[PDB]
Amino acid sequence: MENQIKANTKKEYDEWFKPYAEKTHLKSVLTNSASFCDALPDLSIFEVKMGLATDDREKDSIYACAMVEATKFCAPIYECGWACCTGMVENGLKWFDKNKDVIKLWDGKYSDLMKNVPEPEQLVAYQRAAQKWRQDNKFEINQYTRSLTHSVQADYKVPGEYAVEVKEMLSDMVRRRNILLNHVNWGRELAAGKFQVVFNPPWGDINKTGRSGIPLAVTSMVKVAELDGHKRLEDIRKTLLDLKKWIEDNKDELEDGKGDELVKTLTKQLADAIELAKKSSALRAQGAQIDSIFSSYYWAWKAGITPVTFPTLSQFLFEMGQGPRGGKKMIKALTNTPLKWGKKIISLFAEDDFNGNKLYMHPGVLTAGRMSEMGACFGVVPVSNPEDAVLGSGHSKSLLNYKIDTNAGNPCAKEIVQLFRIQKAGFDLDSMDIVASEHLLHQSLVGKRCHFQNAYKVKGNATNVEIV
Numbered sequence: 001m002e003n004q005i006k007a008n009t010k011k012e013y014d015e016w017f018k019p020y021a022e023k024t025h026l027k028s029v030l031t032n033s034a035s036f037c038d039a040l041p042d043l044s045i046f047e048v049k050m051g052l053a054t055d056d057r058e059k060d061s062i063y064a065c066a067m068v069e070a071t072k073f074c075a076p077i078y079e080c081g082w083a084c085c086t087g088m089v090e091n092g093l094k095w096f097d098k099n100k101d102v103i104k105l106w107d108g109k110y111s112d113l114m115k116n117v118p119e120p121e122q123l124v125a126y127q128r129a130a131q132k133w134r135q136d137n138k139f140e141i142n143q144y145t146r147s148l149t150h151s152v153q154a155d156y157k158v159p160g161e162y163a164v165e166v167k168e169m170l171s172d173m174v175r176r177r178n179i180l181l182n183h184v185n186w187g188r189e190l191a192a193g194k195f196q197v198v199f200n201p202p203w204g205d206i207n208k209t210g211r212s213g214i215p216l217a218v219t220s221m222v223k224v225a226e227l228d229g230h231k232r233l234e235d236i237r238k239t240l241l242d243l244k245k246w247i248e249d250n251k252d253e254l255e256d257g258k259g260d261e262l263v264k265t266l267t268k269q270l271a272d273a274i275e276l277a278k279k280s281s282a283l284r285a286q287g288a289q290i291d292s293i294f295s296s297y298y299w300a301w302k303a304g305i306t307p308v309t310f311p312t313l314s315q316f317l318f319e320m321g322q323g324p325r326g327g328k329k330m331i332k333a334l335t336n337t338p339l340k341w342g343k344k345i346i347s348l349f350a351e352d353d354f355n356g357n358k359l360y361m362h363p364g365v366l367t368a369g370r371m372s373e374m375g376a377c378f379g380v381v382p383v384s385n386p387e388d389a390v391l392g393s394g395h396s397k398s399l400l401n402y403k404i405d406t407n408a409g410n411p412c413a414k415e416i417v418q419l420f421r422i423q424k425a426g427f428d429l430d431s432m433d434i435v436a437s438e439h440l441l442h443q444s445l446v447g448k449r450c451h452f453q454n455a456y457k458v459k460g461n462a463t464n465v466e467i468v
Contacts, residue, residue: 001384003311008087010141017081024390026077030411031401032449033076033144036390040411041069043418050425059426064324066422067436068394070415072321075398077389079144079452080380083293084314089307089383091137092297099136102129103298105212106364110302114350118362120222120279121212123288126364127279127456130294134454139293144401144450152446152460157406157468162417166441166467169420172429173438173463180284180359183216187224191235195243198266207265214276217266221273226280233274240266286442286462287359287434290370292397292451296377299366302348303341310383312339317379320371321393331368358433372396376451397451399440404449416441 007013026034046066053059082088096103105125106113113122131147133139140146158166189197198206203216210216225233240263247259282289305313316337320330331349334342348366361367376395382388402412420437429435445462448455 001311003084003086003089003307003314003383004386005081005085005381005383007082007085010082010138012087013082013085016085017078020081020386021078023387024077030403030408031074031076032403033078033401035075035077035401036073036392037402038073040414041072041418043070043415043422046422047425050422053426056426060327061324063419063422063426064326066419067396068321068323070419071394071396071398072392074401075376075380075393075395076144076401076450076452077381079142079450080377080389081386082141082145083139083296083377083452084381084383086307088137088139089310092133092139092293093301093305093307093310095133095136096298096301099129099132102132103364106362107298107302110348110365113362113365115353115355117356117360119212120276120283121214122362123279123283124276126362127289127291130291130454130456133294133297145452147454147457148447149457150447152458152462152465154465155468156445156465157404157410158413159406159409162410162413163467165417165420166413169417169438169441170463170465170467172435173442176438177285177463180357183220184223184227187220187236188228190221190239191224191228191232193235193239193242195239195246198243198262206262215269215272217269218272218276221270222276222280225273225277230277230281233270233277236270240270283360287357287439288361288363289456290363290373291454291456292373293377294454295364295366295370296374298364299345299348299374300378303344305341309339309341310378313341313374314378314381314383317371317375318382318388318393319379321375321379321395322391326371327368330371396436396440397443400443400448400451404444412444413441416444 005013005016007016021034024036027036027038028034030037030040043066046062050059050062053062103125106118106122109122134147183203186197186202201217206217208216210219221233221236243266244263247254247263251259300310300313316333320326331346334346345366350361350365350367354361372395375393376397379393379395380389380398399412399415402415404410404412416437419440423429423435423437442462443455445465446455446458446460
């Protein structure tokens with residue numbers, strides 16, 4: 001069938017949504033954007049099932065079922081409709097055909113990023129690409145679809161009963177952060193105050209470039225930040241100051257134009273380095289930050305989805321959330337479908353043959369598991385029959401739509417803990433590079449009240465906050 005969410009503007013989409021919302025009887029008691037949630041899922045049965053299981057594939061199935069129950073009815077319907085309306089589908093997809101250059105750094109090295117950790121500039125490219133998308137396509141239409149730019153609130157309130165286990169989650173996250181944290185001598189010399197090294201770089205000219213056309217000066221400085229820690233780039237600003245006072249105190253011994261042109265060039269290179277380093281320190285710390293909707297449309301586009309064929313993607317991803325139908329069941333279904341995009345999606349999947357911590361897989365690379373991203377965006381309202389959404393479909397990032405409000409008794413944090421308990425019962429977590437419930441809680445900490453929010457420009461440390 002065809003995409004029933006016919007809308008080419010926020011206006012037209014609103015004109016669609018008023019009768020639809022009235023029909024499906026939406027609710028706001030326990031969730032930020034109005035959802036199908038009338039009551040808070042009790043996931044306790046799954047601890048029990050879990051605690052009584054033997055092989056880990058049974059345990060995986062159990063956890064997947066609890067995730068479906070937790071999120072089946074809490075998805076932000078209004079935003080999901082809007083992410084999936086006909087104008088959005090048409091424009092969100094063709095956006096990529098217009099912007100081949102804005103995405104070349106990663107897209108053009110996609111095959112490589114299925115196997116290796118990305119360079120900082122590939123991450124800078126992806127995050128700015130995402131912003132362009134949200135501007136170009138007019139995506140940000142309210143709070144729950146906005147890019148967040150606030151800073152990590154020092155405070156996080158949780159009910160008594162849960163405030164324990166939350167702090168326990170906090171502890172392991174802190175533990176984890178530490179195990180992740182814990183032409184280059186040029187940079188280290190420039191930082192210790194030996195500015196004269198800028199007169200004579202070991203690689204040649206100071207303006208000289210390398211990979212991605214970044215100046216060797218800059219990559220040297222980023223690499224010094226990466227090893228001797230962040231605060232060292234500021235020793236280099238103090239050093240550039242000593243350089244400047246040098247030239248000013250001895251302008252005589254320098255060629256006419258040169259000297260001012262040197263300090264300017266260097267100053268810029270420091271600014272560039274700080275901005276590149278900070279991307280790296282963040283990736284190292286907390287792993288890739290996927291912009292769900294932007295990557296969803298990127299993957300749809302690379303698979304070759306069209307507005308014509310989009311409703312089959314929506315239906316597929318909707319079915320996928322009606323029980324444990326991810327993993328090998330999904331791959332098999334995608335392998336079997338007569339639709340071309342099926343096998344094209346599969347070939348986007350990064351092999352588990354990945355050179356490095358999975359945390360650092362570039363957020364524009366697809367995996368079987370990252371299909372939950374396309375689910376939370378495309379598989380909540382099935383655009384061929386919108387009104388079937390009332391049945392539910394469980395995708396994990398839907399959980400961010402749960403209210404934080406101490407009013408509702410922070411259901412978001414309740415569900416995260418419950419899921420956490422279930423994960424404890426079946427697994428030794430120290431063995432996994434990622435604990436799903438910890439990643440979710442981290443996103444709540446950073447202030448995501450909805451997964452259609454881009455939170456990259458949020459400044460702070462989420463692992464260092466106070467659980468009231």
